[PDB]
Design a protein around this ligand. Structure first.
Ligand SMILES: CCCCCCCCCCCCCCCCCC(=O)OC[C@H](COP(=O)([O-])OCC(O)COP(=O)([O-])OC[C@@H](COC(=O)CCCCCCCCCCCCCCCCC)OC(=O)CCCCCCCCCCCCCCCCC)OC(=O)CCCCCCCCCCCCCCCCC
Ligand SMILES: CCCCCCCCCCCCCCCCCC(=O)OC[C@H](COP(=O)([O-])OCC(O)COP(=O)([O-])OC[C@@H](COC(=O)CCCCCCCCCCCCCCCCC)OC(=O)CCCCCCCCCCCCCCCCC)OC(=O)CCCCCCCCCCCCCCCCC
Ligand SMILES: CCCCCCCCCCCCCCCCCC(=O)OC[C@H](COP(=O)([O-])OCC[N+](C)(C)C)OC(=O)CCCCCCCCCCCCCCCCC
Lengths: 327, 482, 65, 54, 384, 65, 192
């Protein structure tokens, strides 16, 4: 029996209902990046419609009980949100996919520092419970803002998708565990999956996706539709950014300082085609230098190198000193 | 033209594939081919190709090893070499010069049911080749001294036959499959009898076998049909007509003899195993269906296919390639379909490390028998496309000429590309299952294993395990283990 | 010495493909790779048939019942 | 059809009996009928055993 | 391989071993399944100065197969592809060393001829650099080498040129033009006549003697091809293998490049009496310089015509050599190879070989008794 | 071909000393030879504790209780 | 006088140049030992290892046989400068043929005496050399090794090395770029 051409498919998947299967050029499984999908979904849910209106009203509670709670716990542990979000403790401890990807792509320090940061706290917490990280460690924990953790998270997720998740083809499968238990014995993977039945071929065109309009809209201003050129728009934008900074202490600035909006406007002007000399040349130079440095991947200098070992056998494993004429 | 765009996908109205009856547009066209018969019975077929740069002439004579006896075994090997040695018109030096001038691309294939002589030359001298080819095979003079000289060469060839391991294993499966018929004896002949051949034996063989009714001359490439036909008639009009009074040995059906042979040799590092079923003759109704089965099984290499390019062996549409990729050391696998006038053999030959002996022993049957119960449409379409491409891939003049000659000899007709495509494309999963159960399900086997047999000695006899291998899901017990 | 054998002896060493999933990149190891470890009962049960037998030039014929 | 590297047959008398040829019913044609007969005999034996098991 | 440096040597081998692995548009699994279910074939090969991908399929599958081929050829290599390629390259190196294949010997011959740089760079890549074939090195190699002006696209069996032009436009038109931008370019090749003598305790000795013959642009390429055909088909067998029982195998090697060339002999025989093998090979090579007879020339030309036209008859090989001719010379020269072969005369071949003999010999020897062989000056004097 | 890998592929092969008593002549193989097969649970029960852990230039100090 | 040139793709190139020395019977053997002591202790370190960094290691080989002998140098250094490793090495050996300074000769003889007497002080090595002396010279000569070393002069060492250099060279090279080295005739001409 063929799943396609089955009676249900013949009766339902017909041109009359626009449910016909359409065959196009071959394309990879997992065609949609998860990070982009979540970006668009978040924008649609928060900044549009009745759902957006409801979720905007809940910004205080969500910020208090989902962001500052995690941040407070991490700071108590001498950690940041990165330590809990860039690589989940589940992946850090036991995950073979993460282990293989890290071994094949990542430098050891990228995860060694993550592990040692938690080792700092848990060498004391397990010995004596209730450990509160002292101020000096908490300071270095607080130094890093969320604006860099988000960059790391997006970089890692995009790399994982473009390199590994984009080169995977799932298949129908039986129980992974070779367990004699009958309940595990007859586990069937492949049915009850939406992806399994949505497309029966690798040539089928994709029937559900985000429209280009939504994708472009999700890349606009997260805070709202403003006009930074007019003074009225800038005032509202600054008000919203100030309340955001208040809600999230270590998101973009230290919890005691204020955000520099002139530098942000200079960055926006430089990035887009709009330009002018309303900013000081020093400001423009500083902004350009900061932009260059932020996008610069660190490289090795090849300096201050330690000495490599060339071990030799000890003296007792070598012949004695004397050497006379053999004959 | 169907439409403006050659690369259109409109006709693919079945989920990206053509429907059951339809065929690709490229295969809807057939090159011209004219077949004629002469008074002597020699059949001339021409399939010209003006654009091609070469012309190939293939002469197929239905004489073969089948027409030999124990007291005259190996006379075909002497015949093939002696024909070039000399002729009444031309000495050895003269024919050697003539062969060199038009290129050394002369291939002599001494088969069991027939012998083929294929010569590929330039278009401007193709006629000359015919004049040569007709003479060399017709007026050859077999001297005693020449036979004495060639005895050593024939004996060395017989001894060296072991160099081509696949060929020697094919000869072994022929020997084991037909034990009560001379058709089982090796093509190179019995070694100890090679020195017993005389000039008179060769002369009698050629006189009683090279008859007008046994000659088919096929031509392909840049060849002028009229000129080639006229020249071939002039050349081959002097061949003696077949005589009924003459006696042709071994004219009865070589009934298939199931068996299991084991050439145990523990100093080879590798094992050559072959498992074959009785297969239809060239005229059986299930001929192109079994060719489709051959395409389904296909061939495998350890440096290609699932053994080299995939994340996992499961991600493909060839069932046998999955298993072969799962086995690191099973290196070579090829499905051979050899049809003859009376009988035929369809089977699989594996070559690989002896540690996977049983895996190579029980695999070929398991897949084939499984097709008797269920075959996925993906495999059907894969084999369909492969057969289409191979049909469109016959371009070399020598290969096409040899195929034309063989088709004429076994059918007295040139089967066109379109007809073959229509025949194979009409196959369905149900038809595939019915053919497989007719020919493969619960059927007898001819098995040969050559090489280190320390693992296989225990089951070296035709027993229950071998008996149930030709079943489907019942009998895979031994394959999976190890 | 830093060499594997320490510069004093040769060690018959092997890195079993068991306990590994990928031989390279995301590609999987052969399903029956472990069978390439010769002379180990753990590799296969067929190794329990460990009778002594060596022969050359021997041909055997068995006919179907 | 033996490998070339094999020589002449050794003087050792490997076979005392010729049962390979003697043990034959010359029915190369119609082999499937004999196979069905063997299957039927096996079926009878298994049926008796299964009756006892029942 | 000529365009690779020591850092990225062997990148072409990794691409070949993982030529089906792409991630941007289609997956390795899917692009393997496309070839499998299309009934056609897809293959890659690479020479010192070329890298050719070729796929043959049915007309209705043409678009998908072309998209797959373009993605495989031009898409940057991924990290997973890099790892798989490293593993496969290690396996290939082990196999080549274990089998003692002739390619492993030709690698030493090229290294001697041109040095570790340029043409001498091994096709399989330096063995010590295999671990360094990461995605970064492969991508750098592609960026510095793969440019729109260095890409050619070929089709055969196409009803209308414009349709295939549009198909290629939909895929390769994006690649921004590299004209006016700093290109890697190729440094001119230099020929050095060094010698290599390897002791291996081998029962057989393999020798090779090659000389700088001519590039593609010259008019003697046909002459050198005819000379190689005469050696392989007629002279090497008759005068070297048949007469002497210690000659295991002799064959004439002839390679031509955009700016250099190498023509010579490679003969393998018994380890002992290697001096006799060397002397006989030198004498046979010098025989052509002495002269060529009319009958021998006609036989060699007939064999060469047969081989070339057999290659040209098949559509795939004809298309491949059409692409190579177009990329070497703007015109197509494979439609009149017969005329050029006929134009060759014995005097021209003799003069070409005699002129080539005067060059610095490239002499490579492997075997048990390579040490007991004439010195380089002695070999030059013998050739002189 | 008569090659171990058939002349077209490389085989990762190894003749385990398990099921063999003597290295040569009449001397037994080392008792813990089988442990030289890395990455196999059958070799040792210590392979169950196989969480990812890599370090260079790391020193730790512990004191007697 | 054969030559061997093996391409090994080693980051380091190892060269060895040897000539036929005298057998045990000849009295020059002691002189040759002094020559070795003139290289492995004093010269070869200063002239090659100290001045040039690409010289991984250089040493002087001196083997004696009942009917023949071997004497020369074995050097190893950076492959990219293989030629520079060769030329200089030859010069060092050739320098010995040019002459030996009094101070260098005294230092080499003192070092050779120290090594030989350190070997002889141990009873096992003394017995082994006693057996070898009896089997070679039919008498015991290790009792007067010091006198033989003292009797050596710079002129004898220079003449012996000059005579040895005239013999057909034996040249071996294993490295990444051994394919580019002076031809055997060029090697002989440089040695000449
Ligand atoms: C205490 C006093 C009574 C003792 C009774 C002992 C048994 C008597 C009968 C058999 C006598 C011969 C024994 C030969 C053993 C050979 C194999 C062996 O030793 O391998 C090591 C074996 C583990 O094998 P393994 O390969 O590692 O597989 C498990 C993995 O860990 C994989 O783990 P996993 O997580 O994937 O799986 C979880 C779990 C999930 O399992 C389940 O959910 C399945 C339920 C358990 C098995 C049910 C079996 C029912 C048998 C009914 C028999 C009726 C009476 C008649 C008996 C005569 C024959 C008909 O899997 C298992 O537990 C499977 C292991 C089965 C162990 C029992 C094997 C022997 C019985 C096999 C059938 C009869 C063989 C006869 C041979 C001789 C000829 C007569 O360990 C044991 O045998 C454990 C013994 C524990 C003894 C404690 C008492 C339990 C007794 C058995 C279960 C009874 C359940 C209640 C039945 C009620 C019926 C109404
Ligand atoms: C009338 C015939 C009755 C026959 C009874 C037979 C009983 C034996 C069991 C048969 C199977 C039962 C149904 C299983 C449903 C599993 C759903 C599922 O996959 O989860 C989706 C869902 C997640 O969905 P998702 O987020 O889209 O994720 C999809 C995954 O990616 C997807 O991940 P994946 O693809 O990796 O999936 C892995 C795994 C799925 O994941 C699991 O491990 C599932 C675990 C489920 C545990 C709870 C099971 C409770 C089952 C109760 C079913 C109702 C029984 C009513 C009986 C009435 C009296 C007869 O797959 C399986 O193991 C599925 C194997 C099932 C094969 C059989 C399918 C049904 C065939 C029915 C027709 C048979 C005709 C005869 C044929 C004879 C031979 C030719 O998981 C859940 O939250 C579990 C939902 C469980 C629902 C239970 C039923 C609720 C409604 C009850 C209504 C009232 C009934 C009457 C009451 C009494 C009135 C008086
Ligand atoms: C409680 C009330 C329930 C309602 C009543 C239903 C009763 C009917 C029960 C049907 C299920 C039991 C299976 C029987 C048939 C299975 C056939 C099969 O497996 O074939 C494929 C299997 C395949 O197994 P295979 O792979 O071993 O076969 C391969 C063999 N070669 C290669 C030679 C082809 O076997 C067959 O091919 C057999 C085909 C014959 C089909 C027999 C059908 C019988 C009809 C059954 C019931 C019909 C409905 C009427 C019932 C009355 C109800 C009112």
């Amino acid at each position: 029996v063929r799943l396609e051409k089955i009676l249900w498919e013949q009766l339902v998947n017909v041109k009359a209902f626009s449910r016909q299967r359409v065959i196009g050029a071959p394309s990879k499984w997992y065609n949609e990046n998860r990070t982009e999908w979540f970006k668009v979904a978040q924008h649609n849910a928060f900044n549009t419609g009745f759902s957006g209106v409801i979720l905007r009203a809940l910004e205080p509670l969500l910020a208090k009980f989902i962001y500052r709670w995690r941040l407070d716990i991490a700071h108590q542990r001498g950690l940041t949100l990165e330590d809990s979000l860039l690589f989940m403790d589940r992946e850090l401890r036991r995950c073979y996919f993460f282990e293989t990807v890290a071994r094949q792509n990542l430098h050891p320090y990228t995860v060694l520092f993550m592990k040692k940061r938690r080792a700092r706290y848990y060498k004391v917490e397990r010995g004596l419970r209730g450990f509160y990280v002292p101020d000096w460690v908490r300071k270095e924990a607080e130094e890093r803002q969320l604006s860099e953790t988000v960059d790391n998270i997006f970089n890692w997720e995009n790399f994982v998708y473009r390199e590994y998740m984009s080169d995977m083809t799932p298949i129908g499968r039986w129980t992974s565990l070779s367990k004699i238990t009958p309940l595990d014995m007859f586990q069937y993977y492949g049915l009850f999956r939406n992806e399994a039945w949505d497309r029966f071929f690798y040539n089928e065109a994709f029937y559900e996706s985000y429209s280009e309009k939504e994708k472009q809209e999700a890349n606009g201003n997260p805070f709202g539709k403003f006009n930074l050129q007019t003074a009225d728009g800038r005032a509202q934008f600054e008000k919203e950014v100030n309340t955001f900074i208040e809600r999230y202490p270590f998101a973009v600035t230290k919890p005691g300082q204020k955000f520099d909006f002139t530098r942000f406007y200079a960055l926006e002007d430089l990035a887009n085609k709009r330009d002018t000399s309303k900013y000081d040349p020093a400001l423009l130079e500083s902004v350009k230098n900061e932009l260059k440095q932020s996008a610069a991947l660190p490289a090795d200098n090849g300096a201050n190198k330690t000495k490599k070992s060339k071990p030799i056998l000890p003296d007792w494993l070598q012949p004695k000193f004397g050497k006379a004429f053999q004959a | 033209k169907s439409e403006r765009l050659q690369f259109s996908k409109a006709r693919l109205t079945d989920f990206g594939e053509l429907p059951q009856g339809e065929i690709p547009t490229a295969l809807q066209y057939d090159r011209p081919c004219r077949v004629e018969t002469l008074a002597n019975g020699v059949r001339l077929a021409v399939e010209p190709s003006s654009v091609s740069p070469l012309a190939a002439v293939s002469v197929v004579v239905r004489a073969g090893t089948r027409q030999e006896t124990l007291e005259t075994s190996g006379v075909a090997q002497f015949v093939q070499r002696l024909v070039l040695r000399g002729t009444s018109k031309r000495n050895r030096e003269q024919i050697e010069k003539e062969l060199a001038l038009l290129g050394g691309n002369l291939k002599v294939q001494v088969g069991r049911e027939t012998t083929t002589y294929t010569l590929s030359v330039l278009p401007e001298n193709v006629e000359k080749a015919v004049d040569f080819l007709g003479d060399i095979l017709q007026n050859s003079v077999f001297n005693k001294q020449q036979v004495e000289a060639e005895k050593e060469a024939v004996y060395n060839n017989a001894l060296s036959a072991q160099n081509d391991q696949q060929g020697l294993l094919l000869e072994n499966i022929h020997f084991t499959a037909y034990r009560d018929h001379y058709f089982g004896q090796p093509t190179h002949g019995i070694r100890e009898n090679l020195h017993n051949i005389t000039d008179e034996v060769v002369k009698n063989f050629v006189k009683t076998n090279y008859v007008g009714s046994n000659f088919v001359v096929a031509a392909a490439g840049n060849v002028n049909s009229q000129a080639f036909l006229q020249a071939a008639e002039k050349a081959f009009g002097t061949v003696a007509q077949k005589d009924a009074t003459t006696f042709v040995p071994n004219t009865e059906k070589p009934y298939f003899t199931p068996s299991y042979m084991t050439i145990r040799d523990d100093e080879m590092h590798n094992l050559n195993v072959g498992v074959f079923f009785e297969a239809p003759s060239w005229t059986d109704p299930d001929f192109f269906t079994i060719n489709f089965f051959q395409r389904i099984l296909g061939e495998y290499q350890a440096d290609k296919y699932t053994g080299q390019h995939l994340n996992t062996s499961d991600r493909q549409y060839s069932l046998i390639h999955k298993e072969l990729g799962n086995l690191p050391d099973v290196t070579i696998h090829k499905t051979h379909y050899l049809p003859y006038s009376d009988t035929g053999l369809f089977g699989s030959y594996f070559y690989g490390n002896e540690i996977f002996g049983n895996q190579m022993l029980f695999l070929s049957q398991m897949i084939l028998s499984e097709y008797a119960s269920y075959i996925n449409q993906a495999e059907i379409y894969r084999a369909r496309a492969k057969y289409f491409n191979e049909l469109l891939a016959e371009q070399n003049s020598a290969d096409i000429a040899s195929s034309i000659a063989t088709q004429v000899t076994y059918l007295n007709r040139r089967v066109p590309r379109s007809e073959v495509a229509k025949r194979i494309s009409s196959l369905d999963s149900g038809l595939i299952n019915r053919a497989a159960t007719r020919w493969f399900w619960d059927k007898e086997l001819a098995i040969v294993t050559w090489g280190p047999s320390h693992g296989l000695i225990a089951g070296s006899h035709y027993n229950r395990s071998i008996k149930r291998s030709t079943l489907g899901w019942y009998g895979n017990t031994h394959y999976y283990i190890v | 010495m830093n060499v594997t054998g320490a510069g004093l002896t040769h060690v018959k060493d092997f890195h079993s493909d068991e306990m590994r999933v990928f031989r390279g990149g995301l590609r999987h190891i052969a399903d029956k790779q472990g069978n390439l470890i010769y002379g180990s009962v753990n590799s296969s049960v067929r190794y329990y048939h460990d009778k002594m037998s060596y022969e050359r030039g021997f041909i055997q014929h068995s006919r179907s019942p | 059809s033996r490998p070339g590297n094999f020589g002449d047959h050794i003087d050792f008398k490997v076979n005392i009996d010729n049962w390979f040829d003697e043990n034959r019913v010359h029915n190369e044609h119609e082999t499937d009928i004999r196979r069905t007969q063997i299957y039927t005999l096996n079926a009878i034996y298994y049926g008796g055993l299964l009756s006892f098991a029942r | 391989t000529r365009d690779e440096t020591n850092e990225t040597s062997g990148s072409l081998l990794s691409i070949k071993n993982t030529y089906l692995k792409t991630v941007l548009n289609t997956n390795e699994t899917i692009n393997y399944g496309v070839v499998q279910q299309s009934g056609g074939s897809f293959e890659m090969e690479y020479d010192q100065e070329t890298a050719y991908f070729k796929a043959n399929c049915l007309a209705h599958d043409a678009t998908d197969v072309f998209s797959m081929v373009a993605d495989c050829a031009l898409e940057p290599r991924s990290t997973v592809a890099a790892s798989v390629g490293v593993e496969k390259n290690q396996n290939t190196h082990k196999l080549e060393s274990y089998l003692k294949t002739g390619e492993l010997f030709n690698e030493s011959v090229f290294k001697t001829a041109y040095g570790l740089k340029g043409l001498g760079l091994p096709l399989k890549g330096l063995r010590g650099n295999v671990k360094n074939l990461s995605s970064y090195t492969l991508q750098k190699f592609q960026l510095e080498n793969i440019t729109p002006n260095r890409i050619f696209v070929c089709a055969a069996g196409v009803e209308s040129h414009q349709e295939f032009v549009d198909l290629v436009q939909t895929k390769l038109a994006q690649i921004p033009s590299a004209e006016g931008q700093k290109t890697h370019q190729r440094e001119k090749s230099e020929y050095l006549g060094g010698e290599v003598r390897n002791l291996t305790e081998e029962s057989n000795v393999t020798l090779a003697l090659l000389f700088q013959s001519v590039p593609w642009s010259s008019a003697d390429i046909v002459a050198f091809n005819v000379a190689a055909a005469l050696l392989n088909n007629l002279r090497l067998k008759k005068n070297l293998l048949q007469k002497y029982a210690y000659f295991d195998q002799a064959e004439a090697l002839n390679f031509h490049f955009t700016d250099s060339g190498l023509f010579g002999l490679r003969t393998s025989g018994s380890a002992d009496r290697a001096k006799d093998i060397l002397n006989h090979s030198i004498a046979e090579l010098k025989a052509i310089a002495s002269g060529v007879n009319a009958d021998e020339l006609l036989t060699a030309k007939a064999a060469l015509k047969n081989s070339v036209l057999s290659a040209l008859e098949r559509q795939t090989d004809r298309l491949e050599e059409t692409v190579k001719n177009v990329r070497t010379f703007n015109k197509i020269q494979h439609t009149d190879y017969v005329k050029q072969i006929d134009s060759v005369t014995a005097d021209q071949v003799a003069k070409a070989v005699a002129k080539v003999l005067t060059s610095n010999p490239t002499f490579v020897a492997q075997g048990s008794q390579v040490n007991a062989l004439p010195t380089y000056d002695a070999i030059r004097n013998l050739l002189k």
